[PDB]
Each structure stands twice: as C-alpha cells, then as structure tokens.
Ligand binder design. Structure first.
Ligand SMILES: [Zn+2]
Lengths: 332, 49, 144, 45, 197, 93, 45
C-alpha cells in the first residue's frame, strides 16, 4: 500500500512543521519532533468518510490544501510546493474519489466586491474571484454597528489545550459595509448559521461629544482603569491615573457648558500637544444612561461613587459624575 | 630640549619601574605650550609649538 | 474610477510574504494582510486611514479602507472605487501582534507609502490640465 | 542661621579627632600605616 | 543588504574577557543587542544564539572570570530552533565560531524562516563596538560604575575598614547628640561587622 | 621641513585661494590632496608654474608632471580632444 | 597602551592618556605603573 507523505507541512497555520500522510483510512498530520511545543504530541487524524471536497490554492508558505469536511469544518494544510500538485491530485482522486479543485484568488488590491455565505466559510469575491475566505468556526461574534455596517469579531487564538501555537499577525475584527435597502438580512443569515451571541462592554459610553480641543467629534468609552476617546481619524487611550483635574464650567453664552480634562502626559497629534481636553455640551442636552456593571461589582467597588442608573439629566452632569467616580478626582 | 636622553620614557611621558637610570636622564617628560611663530610659512607641520 | 492593480501573477508577490504577517510592497504600493492564511493584497489607493492602539501585550491596528457615504475628501469626479449600488466594501480590518516595535514600524511605513502616493497624485494633477506646450526658440543674437 | 562653615583646622595624627585613633592593629596595616608610628605631627601639603 | 559571511561576523567577535571589560557601560546594553556569539549549550556542542536583549538581575551576582569578577548583567538570548533563554555572561566562550556552528545556525534560521544580518548592519555593529571600546569614560560615568560595583561589592578589606571608620564617626556624632537609641543600633552593627583575624 | 605652498590666481589677476600641503611631496597623500584641490574646487587652472631656489624643485616638477600624466587633468573648456594642463618652469627674478 | 595597577585592590588596567586617573572598579585616585618588560640583570655582588 503506497503511503504518500509530505514533510514540512503546517496544520491550521501551526508554528511547528509536521509530517502529512495520505492513507486509505483518511488524512493524518503529526508535528515534527524537533520543536519543544508545550502541547499534546498526538497526531491529527481526519477519517476518509468526513472529506467532502478539496481545494488547492496559494497560501503564505507556498501552496495550501484546503479540505472541506461534511461537519462544516475547514482544515488548512500549507507548505506544499507547486510540483506536489500532480501527485496530490492523483492520490486524492485514487484514495477518496474527490476532485482536487484549483482555486485562483483575486490579487487586484480592491476592497470592494460581493460577499457570499458558503456552507462552511464566508467568501469575499473581487471581480468574480475569491479575495479571501473566513471559516465560520473562526468567527466568535457578529454585531450590526450601523444601518449598512456589519462587524465580525474573530476568536483571538491565545492558549487553548487543543490548538497548536499560531505564527504571525492575527486578524481580530472585520468590518463590512453592505449598501442598499440588505445588511440586516445578511447579518441574520450569518448569525443563524453559527448562533452568534451578542455581548456588551464598557461601563459607560457617550456618543458624538463635541471637542473644542482637540477640534473634532469623539465617542467617550469609560472603563475601570482607563478612558477611551474614539475619533474618525484618531483613537486615544487615557489611563484614569493620568487625569489630574476635571473642570465643569458654564460658558458665558448661557447655552453651552464646558467640561475640561487636564491630562498628564499631554495627548499628542504630532508636534504641539493637548494638556487640556475641552468638551462642549448643550445645557438642554439630556441623556439617560444605565451602567454596564454586575450588582456584586457595583456594591463592592462603586457604591456611593456612581449611580446604578442616571435619570434623564443634563449630559455634562452625568459625564462629570462618572469621571469623578472612575478617576477619584474632584470636579472643579 | 635637555641634553639628556628621552629614550627611556614611555608613551605617557613617565619612565617605568625596573629601568636603570643614570645622571641627567629624563625620568618625567613634560611640555608647556608656546604661541606658534611664523614658521607655518613653509614648515610641513614641523614647527615648534 | 482610476483603475489600479496590486499584482497580476502570484509570482509577482514577493517571497518575503512567507511569515503569516503584514508585509508591505512599496514598489507595487500594496499592503498584504494575513486573512486566515491568505496573502490578500490591499492597494494603498483602496486604503483610507489607520489607527494604532497597544492594548495589553498585543498591538491592535485598525486599517480603514475607502467606503461610500461621507468618506474621503476626494471630489465625485474621481472615485477610488468603481460605482456600484450592489458592491459591498471591506470597511476596516483589525490585526494584533505580540511584537510592538515591528508593528509600529509597519504602521509608519504604511503611512509614509500613503503620503508618497498622495504627493505623486498632486504632482500629476498640477501637470495634468497643463497642455503640452511647444519648446521655446532661443534668439540666435544678443537677447533683450 | 545654622551651621556656617568658617574654615578647616589641621588634625594632629593619632589624636582624638584623627581617623587612626580607632581601627585596632589589623586595620592599621590595611591603611598602609606603620603600627610603630606614634603620631603627634600634622600633614600639610 | 548583502548576506554576511563568516569573516564579517568574526570581525565583531566580542570575547568573554571583552564582556567583562565592557559589560558595565550604559551603551553596552544596545551594543550587545543583535550580536552573534559562541555559546556553551551545556546540555557540549557550542552553538550561536541571537541576543534579544539584556536584563539586570539583582541578587544573582556570579563569578564572571575569577572569584572577584562578580556580575549582575544577564543576556536574554535565543536559539532559532529553541526558545528564549536568559543566560549569564560567562556561558559564552572566547573561542571562535566554527564553520559547522555557523552552518547549523543558518539551518535553524532557515527552518524558522529568518534571515541573516545585513552587511550594512554588520558594519554598523562593528562601528558601534569600535566606538564603545575606544571611548573615554567621563567622571560621572566612573562614579556611576563605582557605585554599581559597590552595590555588587560583597566585601573588600579596604572597603570594610572604610565602612567601620564611617560607622565609628557616626557613632561619636550620635554620642555627642545624647541619642541613646541610635547608638545601640550602631554598636550592634559595629559588633556584627568586626571580629577580624 | 619644507611644505609645498599653492597659490591660484584667475584671469582677473586677483588671488582666489591659497592652500598648504603639509605632508611629504612623495607621499600618496600629497598627490591625492593636490588632485582634490585641482578637481573638486572647480579651480581649473590653465597652466601650472613650478619654481624654486635649488635642484630639489626638479623632483617636485617631475612628480607634478607624472601626476598630470596619470590623472588626465584636462583643462575645462567653456561650451573633443581635451588638452592637458601644462606644467613648466618659471623665471623668477 | 600602558598598564597600570590600583593602589588598593591591585587591579590591572590600561589608560589612553584621556581617561580620568581612576581605578575602574573601586574608584581609587592613586594608581601605579607596571614593571618594564626589559631584561633586568644584577651582578650578585
Ligand atoms: Zn582599585
């Protein structure tokens, strides 16, 4: 029985090379014994009955063999040479009766196209060619971020007792823009496919705040240890310790209210800096906000510093109280 | 220069222990700067400073 | 739409790509991004703006791309994408890395490549509507 | 008004304010001082 | 941009004696960064490691060359095939890197998918080492190095005598101030330090 | 202890630059410095004069002639067999 | 270029006529030159 084997093959973007083997019972992959990989040394085995289809395409480390399973999982094997294609094609056809499909990918560098939800992967097509595909098993969560905007979070692969160390830069989040009255139907189908569960983060967020300095509009997301300013062109992370002083000052126009943060070190945009952040509110702007905190964490850490819910009071008062409670700085 | 011999001095202008010395030999080499003359006319750096 | 391309053949993609990391090709103005083991090229023209945030040990860099709806300041006359109501767009990709220094250098090099591309396009436009003039004929005697 | 410095007084060797009044016999050798030296003189320049 | 040959790497050989001669320099941390040197594996086939950085470790003073050669500097290196390692300075050997050693280092780099230092970078390292070795230290740098070695100083007869004299002076100062609490502590410290032979 | 002095004058008759050669005239450094002075500074003298008080100047003349023949220091001609810059002795009463 | 010896810890080193006169490891201000490498011969009389 001619066992065909390939050395230096990687499984699912593994850091360690392994030996790949084709047998009448299925596919086998085993890590090469030369790397101390804190990790089970157990061979990966895929039964012949679980193989649905196999595609051949360009990967990072040479050519990639992508195996589609009947259980809607995608297995990626990378590290093949271009010459291996003829041997692999003949052996896969002989052993599994499956055609090895050659899949050419779009290299145009365009960020527009059509998404296509295939059984096991989300495919992005550019000029009728696949630019990239994401297996549904790699998608952790999906969330509608606007009327035409879909954000997909990918499982950050850190340390799991069942996965080989990954080598390189990891994709964490993909945002798609789907025009037309269409993004909600696209989201529903994707969400239903893998039962994605929505999550909520950030103790409190304030959207669309006008800053006079730096000039622009920013979302303010507050955390236990840090404040985030999210701006179209600039994201800032300020530690609560770096906030020295909070000023809450009425403007003489008797229509706007100023909230001013002194930050050390001063925020940077290039040459000159921003030691003071100047926010401008309308006095008639009212906001209702519930804190994203568990009842046990609220009672233990924030009782008497923050309110569990703020009623419909002026936005600048709620913001000034939240800043006081999280930074422990007195409002002037 | 003194009429003695300067060949017993090291690179730093100090003689080293264990060296036999005689009268008028130079045991400490010291120089004091002097404003240069018009010898920079045609002297190839070989002018007394 | 000003048509552009990153690579025509897979051979054109540099051999330096073998690292499963973000590789930048200044000659082809291309930002190759590792999407699930795929060397996906993204032309600097399609790229819009970038935001870098070092969260913990990983450096989370969100690379934004041109998307319709109050996007780039470029006038309607020239669009960085082809017109299409049925066209869907990659609006942003966020990557993380344990190596902070290199990831900061990669971000600087993407930003520099964009500045050089914009400067070259301005220089072209300052020469575009300019009509190719005839060559000045020098006076064969003493000129006034 | 506090401790203003008015000058430096030379110290007689082996006197009460000398550093060699202490140090015993062993440390007197580490400091390259002869134990037979009796003191009673100053060191100027 | 050309790959470095054996002679280019040999030009930047930094021996263990040179390490002891220059490890206390403030710039030595960046000087040793990225260098290639022969290392005793111990577990012995000598191999080459790449310096990912250095980390001072207090309380880990070790004999570098002799008994008096106490050192607190540590080098964080790593084999290409193997993982990151924090090693003391004396592990490296003054002997030159052999052809099979450099060949194995190249094979491990190829297995990992890494490259060799550029010839321009090799020249930059060589110039950095030449500047550092021929540099003239300042008075402040000398004081800093002396204080660092004093912190590393376990014991020295001259320094012990100086410390005992300073303690005696402090004790007489406390006595003249009628401080009956400090003087007891100073007497206990003097008793502990003393009892010579 | 006899350094070589160089003085260049333009067609205007006004001194433009004077240089000192403090190395030995038989060293490679002397020839390299003279070539740098001749070429880099755009001096481009039309003729080079050499004179002295004794026969030692003859060796300098020979060395200069060899340098001219070696470096092909042709005269710059304002806008093609470019001609070499002549080196001769000068009467000096 | 020329060796030196510290006056307290007896540590050998060298100077380049530009370093401060100081022992590198204990900071002593007094150093001594090392013996010459020439041959020294005596008449044994
Ligand atoms: Zn010393």
């Amino acid at each position: 029985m001619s066992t065909v084997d390939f050395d230096t093959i990687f499984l699912n973007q593994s850091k360690a090379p392994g030996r790949f083997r084709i047998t009448s019972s299925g596919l086998g992959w085993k890590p090469s014994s030369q790397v101390p990989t804190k990790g089970k040394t157990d061979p990966f085995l895929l039964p012949s009955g679980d193989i649905l289809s196999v595609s051949w395409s360009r990967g990072y480390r040479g050519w990639e063999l992508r195996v589609y399973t009947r259980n809607d999982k995608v297995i990626m094997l990378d590290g093949f040479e271009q010459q291996d294609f003829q041997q692999l094609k003949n052996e896969i056809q002989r052993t599994f009766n499956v055609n090895l499909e050659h899949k050419e990918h779009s290299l145009r560098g365009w960020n527009w196209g059509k998404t296509q939800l295939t059984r096991a992967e989300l495919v992005f097509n550019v000029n009728n060619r696949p630019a990239w595909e994401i297996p549904y098993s790699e998608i952790s969560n999906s969330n509608l971020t606007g009327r035409h905007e879909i954000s997909m979070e990918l499982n950050p692969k850190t340390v799991d007792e069942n996965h080989y160390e990954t080598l390189g830069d990891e994709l964490v989040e993909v945002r798609l823009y789907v025009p037309g009255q269409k993004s909600q139907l696209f989201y529903e189908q994707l969400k239903d496919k893998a039962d994605f569960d929505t999550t909520s983060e950030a103790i409190v967020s304030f959207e669309d705040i006008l800053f006079l300095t730096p000039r622009g509009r920013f979302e303010i997301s507050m955390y236990a240890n840090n404040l985030r300013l999210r701006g179209q062109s600039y994201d800032y992370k300020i530690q609560n310790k770096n906030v020295l002083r909070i000023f809450s000052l009425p403007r003489l126009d008797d229509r706007h209210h100023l909230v001013i943060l002194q930050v050390d070190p001063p925020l940077r945009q290039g040459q000159t800096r921003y030691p003071f952040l100047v926010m401008q509110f309308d006095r008639n702007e009212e906001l209702e906000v519930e804190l994203n905190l568990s009842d046990e964490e609220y009672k233990s850490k924030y009782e008497g510093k923050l309110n569990r819910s703020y009623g419909t009071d002026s936005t600048y008062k709620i913001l000034s109280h939240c800043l006081r409670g999280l930074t422990e700085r007195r409002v002037i | 220069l003194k009429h003695g011999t300067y060949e017993k001095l090291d690179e730093d202008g100090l003689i080293a222990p264990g060296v036999r010395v005689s009268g008028d030999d130079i045991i400490i080499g010291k120089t004091t700067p002097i404003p240069p003359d018009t010898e920079e006319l045609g002297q190839r750096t070989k002018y007394h400073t | 739409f000003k048509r552009y391309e990153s690579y025509v053949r897979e051979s054109q993609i540099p051999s330096k790509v073998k690292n499963l990391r973000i590789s930048i090709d200044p000659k082809a103005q291309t930002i190759i991004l590792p999407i699930c083991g795929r060397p996906v090229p993204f032309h600097i023209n399609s790229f819009k703006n970038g935001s870098k945030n070092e969260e913990g040990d990983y450096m989370y860099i969100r690379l934004n791309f041109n998307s319709p709806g109050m996007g780039s300041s470029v006038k309607k006359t020239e669009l960085p994408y082809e017109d299409g109501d049925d066209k869907e767009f990659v609006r942003s990709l966020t990557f993380r890395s344990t190596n902070k220094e290199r990831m900061s250098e990669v971000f600087k090099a993407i930003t520099e490549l964009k500045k050089t591309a914009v400067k070259r396009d301005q220089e072209r436009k300052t020469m575009e509507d300019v009509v190719a003039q005839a060559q000045l004929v020098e006076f064969k005697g003493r000129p006034k | 008004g506090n401790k203003v410095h008015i000058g430096k007084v030379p110290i007689m060797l082996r006197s009460k304010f000398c550093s060699l009044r202490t140090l015993d016999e062993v440390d007197l050798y580490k400091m390259k001082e002869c134990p037979y030296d009796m003191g009673g003189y100053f060191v100027i320049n | 941009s050309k790959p470095a040959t054996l002679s280019d790497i040999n030009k930047i050989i930094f021996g263990r004696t040179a390490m002891s001669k220059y490890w206390y320099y403030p710039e030595f941390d960046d000087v040793v960064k990225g260098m290639y040197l022969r290392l005793n594996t111990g577990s012995s086939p000598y191999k080459v490691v790449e310096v990912l950085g250095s980390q001072r470790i207090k309380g880990s003073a070790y004999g570098l060359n002799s008994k008096e050669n106490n050192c607190d500097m540590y080098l964080k290196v790593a084999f290409p095939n193997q993982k990151e390692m924090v090693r003391p300075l004396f592990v490296f050997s003054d002997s030159s890197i052999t052809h099979p050693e450099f060949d194995l280092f190249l094979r491990e780099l190829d297995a990992e998918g890494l490259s060799v230092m550029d010839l321009r970078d090799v020249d930059y390292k060589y110039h950095q080492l030449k500047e550092m070795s021929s540099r003239s230290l300042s008075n402040d740098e000398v004081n800093s190095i002396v204080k660092m070695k004093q912190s590393l100083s376990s014991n020295t007869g001259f320094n012990t005598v100086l410390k005992k004299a300073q303690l005696q002076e402090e004790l007489e100062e406390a006595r003249d101030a009628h401080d009956h609490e400090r003087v007891a502590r100073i007497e206990a410290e003097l008793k502990s330090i003393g009892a010579e032979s | 202890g006899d350094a070589v002095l160089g003085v260049f004058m333009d067609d205007s008759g006004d001194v433009k630059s004077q240089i000192k050669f403090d190395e030995d005239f038989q060293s490679r450094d002397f020839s390299d410095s003279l070539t740098r002075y001749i070429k880099s500074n755009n001096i481009n003298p039309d003729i080079i004069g050499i004179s002295g008080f004794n026969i030692h100047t003859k060796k300098l003349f020979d060395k200069v002639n060899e340098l001219v023949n070696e470096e092909r220091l042709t005269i710059e001609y304002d806008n093609s067999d470019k001609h070499l810059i002549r080196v001769i002795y000068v009467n000096d009463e | 270029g020329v060796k030196y010896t510290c006056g307290a810890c007896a540590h050998n080193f060298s100077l380049n006529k530009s370093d401060p006169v100081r022992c590198k490891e204990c900071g002593h201000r007094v150093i001594y030159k090392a013996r010459t490498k020439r041959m020294i011969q005596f008449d044994a009389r």
